[PDB]
Design a protein around this ligand. Structure first.
Ligand SMILES: Nc1ncnc2c1ncn2[C@@H]1O[C@H](COP(=O)(O)OP(=O)(O)OP(=O)(O)O)[C@@H](O)[C@H]1O
Ligand SMILES: Nc1ncnc2c1ncn2[C@@H]1O[C@H](COP(=O)(O)OP(=O)(O)OP(=O)(O)O)[C@@H](O)[C@H]1O
Ligand SMILES: Nc1ncnc2c1ncn2[C@@H]1O[C@H](COP(=O)(O)OP(=O)(O)OP(=O)(O)O)[C@@H](O)[C@H]1O
Ligand SMILES: Nc1ncnc2c1ncn2[C@@H]1O[C@H](COP(=O)(O)OP(=O)(O)OP(=O)(O)O)[C@@H](O)[C@H]1O
Ligand SMILES: Nc1ncnc2c1ncn2[C@@H]1O[C@H](COP(=O)(O)OP(=O)(O)O)[C@@H](O)[C@H]1O
Lengths: 362, 362, 362, 362, 362
DNA sequence: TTTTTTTT
């Protein structure tokens, strides 16, 4: 009779679809008789088999239309507008909710019908990291609180240690868990400005290890970067909004994000020391390294670097109540998986090997 | 009466033609008398001679239209939309089985009654290839599966070595096999982005003989590509979907494809070396030179460059079971045809001549 | 009564016009009475006087149309589509065969009943070219085969020799013969993209007198041409499809054409030297200066730099069977014409005149 | 009742207007009654007063139109299309003959009952110009021939010698005599892409005041025009079609025009020197200066800069036969008008005063 | 029951608006009843209250239109078209005469019965300006003739004198009297390209604050202004057209307008000095300082900045025959008003009183 | 929108 633009836009919202070509492509598939549709029969894609029957009648009429792309364009605008309306009104925790939500929806892929890897050696990495320092389970949820609360000045941690402390590898896992971006400070002041603009609207950041003048006595490479840092004062504080330099575009100005920093054992000014919520402190504990010499697969699957290992760790150790109300109901079912799939004695044996420097699976 | 955009699009889908000009041009040929059509009579191009009889009536009406380019637009979009929907809803495995079917379809024609090239000339290429490196098929199979798995970080291989070592030649055959793209990166960075646009929805990518810098005392002019690459490391990871770009079009959020790289032997930043799965060396060889002066027709016909040679090679060397179940029937059918065609004496006589470097066929 | 867009499209196709403003301007001329048409009466241009009477009735309606630019766009798009269809489906021999037939049509006009050009002045041009190099005739035939075969990494000829050696001139004649374009690579990288865009869907490219560096020892002003070109090793090799641009147009993927590089005598890095297949020397010969200074009709009519003189050279010298099967008869016909209009002794005299450095005619 | 677009296209053709705004703005004036049109009754502007009463009724309906800019767009397109057609089909001789015709209309108007000029003032300018160089009128004739002939590589004239020697004054007169525009090439190289875009479809070019190096020995201020020119080597040669670019436009491929280069006594490289036919060294001659001091009216009215001055010179000195055959009728009539007014005594009076350094106008 | 596009265009022409958004917003205000319109009632802006009552009805229909921006575009086109026609067809004297009428109109408001401004304070303005230089009112008349005649070479004036000696004040008032724009030359040459784009279609330019190289000779600050200038000898002398450019616009060509250069006591080459018609020396005179320090309404109301004050100065001092016949009537009416409102003794007293450095108006 | 601009 004629195409209902209404029904096309419903599907776009329903499927959260926001590519005009994908929307066109998928909606076109409904034009055959769902009554016999082989995808419906095999229930291969929910984005098809949940919808075909309702949309079929409209899809037959859509297939004949000479306006097809324009119908899909309006539909996608509705979905982009919905994101933009919502984006204006997120709490910081709601961001974190979604960041994690999507990682949970990735973790399916690791083990399920895709089955890309093994939840076992994943948990072996979880065991391997937990031993490095106290109570890592709590430490994550503590850092997490800080990044939602975003309390002025009370917003930053310093990972000080030697070189080869592991802090970079941890930093990878943290940023991998939480999002954000990494950034430099070891530049001529001249050049630096645009690098600072890279932060624009990241939730979180990490700063790369900064070349402390005179450090080469410590045999730590030494120079401009720390001189730059303390001149960046108010960016840390988050007291007031601040201008940001995009290349090839004009200024934007906003509250600078909270985040993380990395440090060899260089000199630190009192002023610079004063900024932090804490130092957290890292060193060689080489039986762990010899456990790695016996656990090499964790580097190969790269699980040791994994913020997903952190996600798994919280999913284990912490109270279900400790998660945000709704997504609690997801942590339940991963625990239901994990905790029957893995006893304490299993996790124990693993941690014992690591603590003994023995290969974690030995 | 009135153009059926339906029948236009149906031709576009069935040819997989995906350019408005190429579609526009070819469809216009159909406006003339099929009963007299010299192309149909001489069965010159199947993309014509099959379809003309069916499309003729509509093509005459199309030849009158004032809308012509707009009709071709909606047709071509249906082709891309189908591609992109498959680019999500297929496994990479099923993608290759689809790709292999299409190449097998070409082979069936090329050595059919049309038969327009000698099987033994084409096979002589396979000898040259499995002669270039040992275990050639086996490394080829290893590369293929690495590209099916596409597992993050372990997504890139390097070819490194001097001029005329053959590395370019091999990449061409793999790329003709796998259906990827080459990309050029010896270029200004803030102008490069649309090069990555080309990678949208592709299976695989190749980077060709990038300008490094330093060691140019060896007469190797320096350039920026290595800096560009390690700056662009964020793509190589396969970490998370990135929003790729194309002019006057909506951006395309996707995982960046895996790929392979070729290099005359500049320095690498060890960080840039840190990205790879593997290196392979390549070595100019006089005997593999001298043979071509006689066997010139191989290179004239680009045989040793072309992925059809690889497919014939894998059909030769590999177990039927190594191919996916879906295609294994055709693998049997084609093994039988190679088994019919050749004695090992023929094959080994040639491979002997190839080792001599003269008189490959004798 | 309405415009026939079909008549416009046919006109554009038949004249191979592919510029919307040329088409627009040309078609408007036909709005006047063809009987009174002084251009027809004079027979100024064939693209007019063959057509005016036939298109007159439609041009009178076109002159009133409100749509004009849109109609012309469609007609031009049809011509463009034909080129793309041809480019993908014809063998390179057919492309050259078609290009040869066209030049032979011009020669049917230039030396037609009008006698509009002097066949003796044109033939005189051939002799001066023939003395430009050793075995000139062979050198042309070799070059055509090379371009038609389009063999990987055997695709480029280097013309090298002093200022005013003749190399630019020989390139220019070959370029017209095959059809293709010149490109100025000395410009800076940021605009080279659209420079290379020129080459899309062309038979040859010519790179002109690229600047090297350090030859200012010899006062050869340095420039980036050589450095620029060594970014583009990939393009010369013809081994993989490259991505080409136009403004407000998405990239086109295809193989980069073969061609010629002219060269005042800067140095060459082996990466680039490896990619040429043949270097040809050129030298000042004062007696050619003395001849040209007394034979200046050669330059005024651009005879020696034009392509048609090379075709006449081929006709004078090659066995007919060396021409592609279809044109062989037209070659027989022109051979007879030339053999009739000139003796061999006349040609010997013309060569001798040039050898003496006297004006070509006595 | 509706707009005649044909009447607008006539006006655009008639005025040869090719700015949509200028066309629009003028056409809008015709909506008031010619009967009262004070511009008509002042009879000040030809492109108004000739036409108002014809277009009147259509201008009133155009005033009410909702489409106005589209109508003008089609009209300007037609005038533009006319130029492109002509730029292929005309000989350079017909072009020059046309350019003369238009200047001759302005000469008829200027010295008409407009009263608007004193031919005695303009003729004094001819005496000044003819005094500046030996054999001045033969120099103009030789230059005009050179531009009509456009012999490859033999295309450019180089003007040298001190500042304030009138070289740019002379260049302006030739540039107004022909069609063409000037360019400034001492620019940043990357901007130069759009600078050369100005040359598109024109007859002459003048490169204005190229700066070299070494001349700063005299403190000729140093610059890079010389080195920039030497990159445009193929543009000077005019041997093959170069690629030319405007903002937001795809390149048009075209033979770059012939022209003039003006400079002080910097050096020129071999390669660039080789590309000039003729070198004119102007010299300071203070009797000319003291004449001009007492001859202020020349520069006040821009006489000695102006191509109209040269044209009066040619009509004086050159035989009637030297003009293209069509205009010889008008030329004879203007020769009569000159001699009817100026006795040779008057011209000898003038040249005598100039030679004396006396104010010319006895 | 339709929008009259004509009434909207008449309003745009009437107000001389040429920004579509400024045009749009203002017209929509008329849709409310003018009869209670507070903007009418308060008599805020003439551009509103003159027209609200007239366009009310058409604005009421306009407010419902779905076409609104499309209407405004055609309206703005009309105003730009008027400027474009005027930009070619008027004498420089006629341009200035139009400019003067606008200032005279604005004076009728400022000093009206609605008069926002004290004509007595503005007369104090004229006193302080008349004190600033020798021979002031004859100096202005001579500057104006110079800009109107625009005689080549002899086009430019140089202001110099100490810091805080009035030079930019006078320049800004002259710039406002004529219209024009200021320019900054003290740059690296790359940006200088778009700087000059400002000058397109201006009647005047001012080169402010030209730094001399090595001005610390005087102990002035150094800068490249002078060395940047003297490249541009064509631009000042204005005998010939120059290419001019704005961001995102194709180049245009015109004579560069006449203007002023200002500086402190830097060096001037004779190469620069010969560019100038007159050099005006300013001096700090302390009674003016103490007068401003007792007459600050001058500064605070910006009186001595404003072109109106130079217009008033001309009206009071100059003979009527020095204006154009077009405006001589208005000049008489204003002269009558001022000669009624002020005695010669009273204004003579102000000049005497400013000579005392006491505040103007006691 | 791209392009041009920004950027070097
Ligand atoms: N191993 C080899 N031994 C000898 N000749 C070779 C070998 N491989 C390639 N060739 C010759 O070198 C030509 C170019 O090969 P190819 O482009 O693959 O080499 P490459 O090492 O990638 O070169 P480049 O670094 O210059 O691009 C081939 O066409 C063939 O003629
Ligand atoms: N072999 C020759 N001997 C003498 N004069 C020559 C010779 N070849 C060309 N000429 C003259 O040199 C002019 C320029 O020729 P051409 O442009 O082909 O030379 P080129 O070596 O390519 O120069 P360039 O590098 O400067 O462009 C010709 O027009 C002719 O006048
Ligand atoms: N031969 C001459 N001898 C003396 N004065 C001259 C001579 N020719 C020109 N003049 C004076 O030189 C003035 C400047 O002329 P013009 O701008 O054309 O000089 P130019 O030397 O060609 O300049 P540029 O090098 O800046 O292009 C003229 O207006 C005239 O007053
Ligand atoms: N002749 C003068 N005598 C005394 N004070 C003066 C005089 N002219 C200007 N002033 C004072 O100088 C201040 C600044 O004037 P103005 O901006 O025109 O100076 P300038 O020297 O032209 O500046 P600049 O060169 O920095 O642009 C005025 O506001 C006024 O206080
Ligand atoms: N417990 C440990 N014992 C010994 N070495 C360690 C330990 N943890 C980390 N390292 C060393 O740190 C090296 C680099 O890890 P990284 O995350 O980069 O630390 P950093 O950022 O401090 O350099 C590792 O290769 C490892 O040898």
């Amino acid at each position: 009779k004629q195409v209902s633009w209404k029904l096309v836009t419903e599907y776009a919202m329903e499927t959260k679809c926001d590519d005009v070509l994908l929307l066109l492509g998928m909606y076109l598939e409904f034009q055959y008789s769902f009554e016999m549709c082989l995808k419906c029969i095999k229930k291969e894609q929910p984005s098809h088999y949940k919808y075909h029957e309702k949309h079929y009648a409209n899809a037959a009429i859509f297939a004949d239309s000479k306006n097809q792309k324009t119908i899909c364009q309006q539909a996608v605008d509705t979905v982009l507008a919905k994101k933009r309306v919502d984006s204006l009104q997120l709490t910081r925790e709601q961001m974190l909710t979604n960041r994690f939500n999507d990682l949970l929806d990735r973790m399916d892929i690791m083990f399920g019908s895709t089955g890309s890897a093994d939840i076992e050696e994943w948990m072996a990495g979880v065991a391997w990291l937990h031993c490095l320092l106290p109570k890592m389970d709590s430490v994550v949820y503590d850092f997490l609180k800080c990044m939602v609360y975003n309390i002025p000045k009370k917003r930053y941690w310093l990972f000080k240690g030697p070189i080869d402390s592991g802090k970079t590898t941890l930093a990878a896992a943290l940023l991998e868990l939480c999002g954000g971006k990494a950034l430099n400070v070891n530049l001529p002041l001249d050049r630096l400005n645009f690098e600072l603009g890279v932060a624009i609207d990241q939730f979180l950041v990490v700063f790369e290890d900064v070349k402390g003048t005179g450090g080469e006595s410590r045999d730590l490479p030494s120079g401009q970067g720390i001189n730059n840092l303390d001149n960046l004062r108010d960016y840390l504080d988050g007291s007031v909004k601040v201008n940001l330099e995009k290349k090839h575009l004009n200024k934007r100005t906003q509250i600078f994000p909270p985040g993380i920093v990395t440090m060899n054992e260089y000199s630190v000014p009192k002023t610079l020391q004063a900024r932090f919520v804490k130092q957290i402190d890292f060193r060689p504990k080489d039986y762990l390294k010899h456990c790695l010499e016996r656990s090499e697969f964790l580097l190969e699957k790269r699980i040791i670097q994994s913020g997903i290992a952190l996600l798994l760790m919280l999913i284990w150790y912490r109270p279900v109540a400790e998660f945000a109300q709704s997504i609690q109901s997801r942590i339940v079912e991963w625990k239901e998986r994990l905790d029957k799939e893995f006893s304490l004695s299993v996790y124990q044996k693993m941690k014992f090997n690591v603590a003994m420097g023995i290969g974690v699976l030995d």
